[PDB]
């Protein structure tokens, strides 16, 4: 009955989908063909896989995912790889030419050709699903496809489906390292469009994950696979309460509702704990107090901004494994009794707690050790506003000379939209200021 | 000792735009709240005067 | 899918494109017959980007070799990979240009242009979704500098939105082999700045210097020059031919590399260049690759970038690496030499990674940089053109073909305004806005 | 020269205002806590007669 | 400039003492609410506790303004110090073969 | 020429390039023009329809 | 054309329970009774008579394709709770800027809730 349909867009979307779907198949017991390991009866159950997979005639399972991209090679790799016979051919949608780091190309010219086909495929998947819980949408703010076509898909998805949740996993630009020069323009223009068509977001930048992997997992030269595994672990802990039973289960709509205080503040920051290697794991007790203390370290957030530069407004907290409510409450009380963690005034009780039984599985060839208990964290705070200020800094000092804008205009987008988007981000920053203010009369 | 404490540059065109969110009930509360906000600007941390107290 | 049509003009174009096709044939596993004898599957998955299918499991290159004198075409056809080219694509006149740009452009190139447009239309209509054209020529000659510009001007009109690269051989001023070289250079750069997407400026003197001091060859012939240039041309589109961790291609590079349409001249470079003992003593790593890439003795143009501000920089890496080392090194090189990058563009560097290493190697990297120091070549061309065109010397050859005199004047004017806007972007300040935000 | 002239006058006031505001605060609490003892003596005194 | 940073931390340490004092006073009034209703009758010492609060709020201000004038001077000290070194390299640059 | 002014001036004063409608028809990229395929109404609205 | 009501069985036919997860057509809950018989309002081959009135809307339905929809589609969810006085106006102007989207069958019909 539970149902999340995946709408992964872009190169980042496709690679994150590869990691997540390998994790899901290993968790549920699927083999790379798409079969159960035996010739088991369809009169048996373990139908938990129904939240992600769909049954066919032959007793085979098909994912509820639509990898979309506008360059052929990334999806040709998944067509040719080990999981080739797992995905339906018609689900993996590609295009002949890509936007090439151009939101304008990906929004008005190239995206508008493949809007209809992917909409039809999502419509068929939603037809298959019985009680649809939500749409999970993964993309980046730098790449032209994953910015422009994702924005346009969101805009049309809001029309086609008014109520349903559209969760947003996003790759935010890092404060220092960058794989692009024009990416402030994309990262400026996509958020102005998706400000009014979005429910929750989980922006992550790769620099902080680089720091976490180099500091905790003892890998001095990891690769994007090692980041994708961590992202897949985050999504797994999000959907665990849907999949398997728990002492206090929590849907998607619950932690959507208790995380967005105002209609233009929908930007939480993730956190996972513990992330430690086997050699370190052999030496440390891993208890609820330890992991919940590690979740609040400003050296563990995968967004390069310190919560000590702001105030938390909401905190969704997701425990998993061999955990006990009494110890959870003791740990949260200890967290509360600390001045280094500061809350806003109109949020006296700012926690939403969920508990799941099954420990997270371990993928062979991964990085993490096998641990009996873990925790995910989704904190909405105003310490994100400095990141928006830095993005405005870079966008303004590029936009003064009117650089790179000939590309967009020649594609066919008006130039006043640049000014309008920058003004709306200024308005959003001032909104963050106003909700950060305290009132004492 | 390097002494760095400043805000990243923004163009004066995009300034002075009013906010889109109005939360406080009355402007009488708003002005007092923002006045009290201005005063801690030498003791707040990070940037944009939104941190926790220094020390 | 995403095809490239290769224009080849002049003797320079023919020899360097011959080496270029040899390099890609060895990279993709092609025998002198033309068949595929490779072992890996990725070697024949996207081979349609440059090749076309022929019966017997044959692949014919998507190349157009154009020349006004038949003597070069014989050497190209009798070379090592000579018979791979389809004979109908060879297009050649019967009379040369004599290093006369006017002869190549107006009188004699006007007859070959119809047939070569027919052949390039043949090859453009063959492919389904053509990305564009990549042309190879020299500016100090008679046909590549001459009728090559006519080709560029006509096919820009016929196929506007497609991409065009030009691997132009510019004149070195320190060493030269032609007296009338400045005239052709200045009458060609105007056509380049008006109708071209990207231009890579390669200099034979720079290549000679690199072969002298880096590879330490006793005898540097033209083969090594062409091999270096062709390695660069392969490193540009390797990410289009092969999959990687972070993909990119030519339009991505152009969009993130050209801030305004007038400034499209780049200095290229190749990272792993070592001799015998150098190979023995040197461990091929990412920081060493970045260090040698940014060493100014490694550049293959004739302009030191310690005399200019690096407008934008691109690196396309080759092999299987860890992206943390790549990004850390590029942040390090951005922070250290702080003054050498313009300040009104944060993160002036654009990166790409392709998995397949070049054949014979475990890692490699390619640099494409736009800096203002490239105006050092236009200043030198303009001075040597002033000294010549002042006295109306060698002018009867050009004016006998039927051109007027104001063409030199307007070419020099446009060249001068190009370098003027380059210096305006040179001495530009970031924390300042005016004259456009008055509204 | 100008900032050096400006600095020395400024630095003394920061040190001078530091000690006085430290000194004033301790005077506030001693007088205030004395009155609480002054309320204690009367309540103990009335308790005797009760 | 170096002297100013320690004068900056010296005053900020006192600002916590001003802040700690404001908690001490408000803590006491809560305990002053614990007394039974016979003792709950307001007295003169309650006015003194209110008198302590107004001062600490006003003493908070002088230390608040203490640092705001400290910051603006401290930035101007940096820029002059910055450009002074910048200008030094200009004249030092033509003596590079000299002893200097 | 104050090229920084002119380059800004050419961008700000101008119009977009209108894209022609194109639709993709298959799980791999297949661009087709939309105004002649018969998906767009075209002939029904124009002309002396029914006369 | 019309969507009737299965009365006590209308729970089985509701759009979400039929796995149609989108905006759906409304259902006529009450039926009125007509007395007497019916006049003829069309010629042969279904031509409406000169006297009978006709609707003025489009005779070919109302679909809006991708290349016909506006470039800035406003959201369905409009919740004017904490918005300022002008900001609620500006969003509402964006809602009502394009009447052809609202009248379109595929077009959005947004709900507006709260006030500044
Ligand atoms: N964490 C993570 N980030 C990625 C991954 N792939 C790409 N990115 C980020 O995405 C940004 C650019 O978007 P891409 O996904 O690379 O490319 P795209 O989304 O297809 O957009 P186009 O290239 O214009 O077609 C880069 O800055 C990368 O840092 C990935 O696999 N993992
Ligand atoms: N780098 C390089 N330069 C070359 C090559 N062949 C010729 N040149 C240079 O090109 C110039 C002559 O070009 P030219 O033959 O006149 O061009 P054409 O008249 O169009 O055929 C000479 O200065 C040579 O140094 C080559 O294979 N590589
Ligand atoms: Mg891409």
mmCIF file of N, CA and C and ligand atoms in Angstrom, chain A residues 9-13 15-16 69-71 98-102 140-147 171 178-180 183 206 209-210 224 227-228 231, chain C residues 245-247 252, ligand 1:
data_model
loop_
_atom_site.group_PDB
_atom_site.id
_atom_site.type_symbol
_atom_site.label_atom_id
_atom_site.label_comp_id
_atom_site.label_asym_id
_atom_site.label_seq_id
_atom_site.Cartn_x
_atom_site.Cartn_y
_atom_site.Cartn_z
ATOM 1 N N UNK A 9 16.538 12.668 -11.746
ATOM 2 C CA UNK A 9 16.861 13.470 -12.922
ATOM 3 C C UNK A 9 18.357 13.753 -12.942
ATOM 4 N N UNK A 10 18.968 13.631 -14.122
ATOM 5 C CA UNK A 10 20.341 14.056 -14.316
ATOM 6 C C UNK A 10 21.350 12.957 -14.072
ATOM 7 N N UNK A 11 22.620 13.306 -14.291
ATOM 8 C CA UNK A 11 23.698 12.363 -14.016
ATOM 9 C C UNK A 11 23.766 12.022 -12.537
ATOM 10 N N UNK A 12 23.686 13.040 -11.680
ATOM 11 C CA UNK A 12 23.647 12.796 -10.246
ATOM 12 C C UNK A 12 22.424 11.976 -9.874
ATOM 13 N N UNK A 13 21.280 12.281 -10.486
ATOM 14 C CA UNK A 13 20.080 11.512 -10.217
ATOM 15 C C UNK A 13 20.229 10.047 -10.580
ATOM 16 N N UNK A 15 23.086 8.246 -10.978
ATOM 17 C CA UNK A 15 24.065 7.540 -10.155
ATOM 18 C C UNK A 15 23.543 7.309 -8.736
ATOM 19 N N UNK A 16 22.844 8.298 -8.169
ATOM 20 C CA UNK A 16 22.230 8.111 -6.859
ATOM 21 C C UNK A 16 21.158 7.033 -6.932
ATOM 22 N N UNK A 69 17.495 11.517 -18.174
ATOM 23 C CA UNK A 69 18.732 12.207 -18.490
ATOM 24 C C UNK A 69 18.602 12.703 -19.919
ATOM 25 N N UNK A 70 19.463 13.639 -20.303
ATOM 26 C CA UNK A 70 19.469 14.135 -21.671
ATOM 27 C C UNK A 70 20.789 13.870 -22.382
ATOM 28 N N UNK A 71 21.632 13.002 -21.825
ATOM 29 C CA UNK A 71 22.823 12.513 -22.495
ATOM 30 C C UNK A 71 22.795 10.991 -22.496
ATOM 31 N N UNK A 98 22.091 17.294 -24.705
ATOM 32 C CA UNK A 98 21.885 17.772 -23.346
ATOM 33 C C UNK A 98 21.998 19.290 -23.276
ATOM 34 N N UNK A 99 21.518 19.837 -22.155
ATOM 35 C CA UNK A 99 21.508 21.285 -21.970
ATOM 36 C C UNK A 99 22.911 21.851 -21.814
ATOM 37 N N UNK A 100 23.847 21.048 -21.307
ATOM 38 C CA UNK A 100 25.253 21.424 -21.152
ATOM 39 C C UNK A 100 25.399 22.656 -20.254
ATOM 40 N N UNK A 101 25.037 22.453 -18.983
ATOM 41 C CA UNK A 101 25.187 23.467 -17.933
ATOM 42 C C UNK A 101 24.440 24.750 -18.279
ATOM 43 N N UNK A 102 23.219 24.605 -18.777
ATOM 44 C CA UNK A 102 22.424 25.752 -19.205
ATOM 45 C C UNK A 102 20.979 25.497 -18.789
ATOM 46 N N UNK A 140 20.408 17.852 -9.017
ATOM 47 C CA UNK A 140 21.457 18.791 -8.663
ATOM 48 C C UNK A 140 21.050 20.195 -9.084
ATOM 49 N N UNK A 141 21.634 21.181 -8.412
ATOM 50 C CA UNK A 141 21.407 22.575 -8.757
ATOM 51 C C UNK A 141 22.433 23.119 -9.737
ATOM 52 N N UNK A 142 23.466 22.353 -10.061
ATOM 53 C CA UNK A 142 24.478 22.832 -10.976
ATOM 54 C C UNK A 142 24.194 22.469 -12.416
ATOM 55 N N UNK A 143 23.878 21.201 -12.657
ATOM 56 C CA UNK A 143 23.731 20.728 -14.016
ATOM 57 C C UNK A 143 22.490 21.274 -14.691
ATOM 58 N N UNK A 144 22.614 21.485 -16.004
ATOM 59 C CA UNK A 144 21.532 22.096 -16.755
ATOM 60 C C UNK A 144 20.282 21.243 -16.788
ATOM 61 N N UNK A 145 20.443 19.936 -16.987
ATOM 62 C CA UNK A 145 19.289 19.046 -17.020
ATOM 63 C C UNK A 145 18.619 18.996 -15.658
ATOM 64 N N UNK A 146 19.368 18.572 -14.641
ATOM 65 C CA UNK A 146 18.860 18.427 -13.292
ATOM 66 C C UNK A 146 18.409 19.720 -12.648
ATOM 67 N N UNK A 147 18.693 20.869 -13.260
ATOM 68 C CA UNK A 147 18.086 22.119 -12.828
ATOM 69 C C UNK A 147 16.841 22.454 -13.641
ATOM 70 N N UNK A 171 21.424 18.433 -4.704
ATOM 71 C CA UNK A 171 22.856 18.629 -4.530
ATOM 72 C C UNK A 171 23.116 20.129 -4.595
ATOM 73 N N UNK A 178 34.030 23.520 -6.698
ATOM 74 C CA UNK A 178 33.007 23.639 -7.720
ATOM 75 C C UNK A 178 33.480 22.948 -8.987
ATOM 76 N N UNK A 179 32.569 22.214 -9.617
ATOM 77 C CA UNK A 179 32.825 21.570 -10.894
ATOM 78 C C UNK A 179 32.323 22.400 -12.060
ATOM 79 N N UNK A 180 31.966 23.659 -11.820
ATOM 80 C CA UNK A 180 31.390 24.486 -12.864
ATOM 81 C C UNK A 180 31.649 25.949 -12.554
ATOM 82 N N UNK A 183 27.401 27.662 -12.550
ATOM 83 C CA UNK A 183 26.429 27.035 -11.656
ATOM 84 C C UNK A 183 25.712 27.976 -10.681
ATOM 85 N N UNK A 206 28.770 18.383 -1.698
ATOM 86 C CA UNK A 206 29.712 17.278 -1.709
ATOM 87 C C UNK A 206 30.968 17.545 -0.894
ATOM 88 N N UNK A 209 30.588 16.081 2.622
ATOM 89 C CA UNK A 209 30.679 14.625 2.585
ATOM 90 C C UNK A 209 32.112 14.183 2.333
ATOM 91 N N UNK A 210 32.866 14.936 1.526
ATOM 92 C CA UNK A 210 34.288 14.650 1.366
ATOM 93 C C UNK A 210 34.998 14.716 2.708
ATOM 94 N N UNK A 224 32.827 9.082 -6.043
ATOM 95 C CA UNK A 224 31.411 9.437 -5.965
ATOM 96 C C UNK A 224 30.526 8.267 -5.556
ATOM 97 N N UNK A 227 30.062 8.460 -1.834
ATOM 98 C CA UNK A 227 29.064 9.453 -1.451
ATOM 99 C C UNK A 227 27.652 8.946 -1.721
ATOM 100 N N UNK A 228 27.471 8.284 -2.866
ATOM 101 C CA UNK A 228 26.163 7.761 -3.230
ATOM 102 C C UNK A 228 25.683 6.713 -2.242
ATOM 103 N N UNK A 231 24.227 8.588 0.692
ATOM 104 C CA UNK A 231 22.930 9.161 0.332
ATOM 105 C C UNK A 231 21.854 8.078 0.308
ATOM 106 N N UNK C 245 33.024 9.439 -14.535
ATOM 107 C CA UNK C 245 32.329 9.756 -13.291
ATOM 108 C C UNK C 245 31.547 11.055 -13.415
ATOM 109 N N UNK C 246 32.163 12.085 -13.988
ATOM 110 C CA UNK C 246 31.504 13.359 -14.257
ATOM 111 C C UNK C 246 31.686 13.676 -15.736
ATOM 112 N N UNK C 247 30.614 13.543 -16.504
ATOM 113 C CA UNK C 247 30.702 13.697 -17.946
ATOM 114 C C UNK C 247 30.673 15.167 -18.347
ATOM 115 N N UNK C 252 29.300 21.910 -23.428
ATOM 116 C CA UNK C 252 29.498 22.232 -22.018
ATOM 117 C C UNK C 252 30.733 23.100 -21.827
HETATM 118 N N1 LIG H 1 27.061 13.628 -4.899
HETATM 119 C C1 LIG H 1 27.042 13.522 -6.221
HETATM 120 N N2 LIG H 1 27.038 14.653 -7.011
HETATM 121 C C2 LIG H 1 27.026 14.541 -8.360
HETATM 122 C C3 LIG H 1 27.020 13.290 -8.949
HETATM 123 N N3 LIG H 1 27.005 13.455 -10.285
HETATM 124 C C4 LIG H 1 27.002 14.778 -10.554
HETATM 125 N N4 LIG H 1 27.023 15.465 -9.373
HETATM 126 C C5 LIG H 1 27.014 16.929 -9.231
HETATM 127 O O1 LIG H 1 26.132 17.485 -10.186
HETATM 128 C C6 LIG H 1 26.618 18.726 -10.653
HETATM 129 C C7 LIG H 1 26.312 18.928 -12.134
HETATM 130 O O2 LIG H 1 25.203 18.165 -12.553
HETATM 131 P P1 LIG H 1 25.457 16.718 -13.198
HETATM 132 O O3 LIG H 1 24.653 15.675 -12.470
HETATM 133 O O4 LIG H 1 26.929 16.414 -13.120
HETATM 134 O O5 LIG H 1 25.032 16.813 -14.742
HETATM 135 P P2 LIG H 1 23.484 16.875 -15.154
HETATM 136 O O6 LIG H 1 22.591 16.864 -13.940
HETATM 137 O O7 LIG H 1 23.155 15.728 -16.075
HETATM 138 O O8 LIG H 1 23.313 18.250 -15.964
HETATM 139 P P3 LIG H 1 23.976 18.432 -17.415
HETATM 140 O O9 LIG H 1 25.413 17.992 -17.361
HETATM 141 O O10 LIG H 1 23.885 19.878 -17.838
HETATM 142 O O11 LIG H 1 23.219 17.569 -18.391
HETATM 143 C C8 LIG H 1 28.115 18.706 -10.421
HETATM 144 O O12 LIG H 1 28.503 19.875 -9.742
HETATM 145 C C9 LIG H 1 28.384 17.499 -9.550
HETATM 146 O O13 LIG H 1 29.055 17.887 -8.379
HETATM 147 C C10 LIG H 1 27.024 12.153 -8.161
HETATM 148 O O14 LIG H 1 27.017 11.045 -8.685
HETATM 149 N N5 LIG H 1 27.034 12.271 -6.793
#
